[PDB]
Design a binder for this molecule. Structure first.
Ligand SMILES: C=C1CS[C@H]([C@H](NC(=O)/C(=N\OC)c2csc(N)n2)C(=O)O)N=C1C(=O)O
Ligand SMILES: C=C1CS[C@H]([C@H](NC(=O)/C(=N\OC)c2csc(N)n2)C(=O)O)N=C1C(=O)O
Length: 269
């Protein structure tokens, strides 16, 4: 409770300057210390649901040994805006594992919808999150409609706290079997879209796995990550933003600054 109080005023100043709302939850898995700022409020998931989507795929692959290497063929109608990987394999298809890595590491939208189909749609991903004890997460729509980020709309949202709690269960806890857990971590470590967010806030020698989200409207963007200080227990954190006007721009610098404040509050230099 006191760590949250240490950074309450700096967080309020950061979000005042940003012109919107910032939600942060961070947990030191070594001490159990946490820092919260609007951590239980709902923010749009945007692209960040794709990390949990890949985790749900891995969970299913624990029972279906052939799932990850199953080839998925798709037509041009499957390609939606921002499919930088899947468009290069339109004429060949890709495996479920390749689609998952593309959804995580490039935010590939065609890949994300194809995987959602394999899981039974937004309700199927929501069901997976319930199965690990997350009662907050909800996915309701497909790409790209899920990015509307409408103020007050609970569709396709979660809270920073629930995002962090579910991330910890999947990457460090027992929600996935050990081989699948390491694959999820490896996919997150290989993300290419987050160099200016949580990654910009940590020392160069720390290992980081993250998944970003960018709705493109309402100043709504986010990032969640597991970070490993060298020789120390990992930290799990989530930073989500939104703003009142549709034309309001998101800020990667604000996300990185919020991550820095969270780590400062936890006392990790
Ligand atoms: C934030 C969203 C959610 S997706 C929705 C939709 N738009 C598209 O699916 C789209 N092109 O559709 C011609 C698109 C999304 S990203 C890109 N490069 N293109 C719609 O027109 O209703 N609208 C918005 C919004 O911007 O307000
Ligand atoms: C950094 C990226 C790459 S672009 C990807 C994508 N988002 C959009 O193309 C988008 N605005 O991007 C400025 C959008 C969607 S609807 C609308 N009106 N705008 C996605 O939704 O996956 N996401 C992220 C990420 O942070 O992972």
């Amino acid at each position: 409770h006191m760590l949250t109080n240490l950074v309450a005023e700096p967080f309020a100043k950061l979000e005042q300057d940003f012109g919107g709302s910032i939600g942060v939850y961070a947990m030191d898995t070594g001490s159990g210390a946490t820092v919260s700022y609007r951590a239980e409020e709902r923010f749009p998931l945007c692209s960040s649901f794709k990390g949990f989507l890949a985790a749900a795929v891995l969970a299913r692959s624990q029972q279906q040994a052939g799932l990850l290497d199953t080839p998925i063929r798709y037509g041009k109608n499957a390609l939606v805006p921002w499919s930088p990987i899947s468009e290069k394999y339109l004429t060949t298809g890709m495996t479920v594992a390749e689609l998952s890595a593309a959804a995580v590491q490039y935010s590939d939208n065609a890949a994300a919808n194809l995987l959602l189909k394999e899981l039974g749609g937004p309700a199927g991903l929501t069901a997976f999150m319930r199965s690990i004890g997350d009662t907050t997460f909800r996915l309701d729509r497909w790409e790209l409609e899920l990015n509307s980020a409408i103020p007050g709309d609970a569709r396709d949202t979660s809270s920073p706290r629930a995002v962090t709690e579910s991330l910890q269960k999947l990457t460090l806890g027992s929600a996935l079997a050990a081989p699948q857990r390491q694959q999820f971590v490896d996919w997150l470590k290989g993300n290419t879209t987050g160099n200016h967010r949580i990654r910009a806030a940590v020392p160069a020698d720390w290992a980081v796995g993250d998944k970003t989200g960018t709705c493109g409207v309402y100043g709504t963007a986010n990032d969640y990550a597991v970070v490993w200080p060298t020789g120390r227990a990992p930290i799990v954190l989530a930073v989500y933003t939104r703003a009142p006007n549709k034309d309001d721009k998101h800020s990667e610098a604000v996300i990185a600054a919020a991550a820095r404040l969270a780590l400062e509050g936890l006392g990790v230099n």
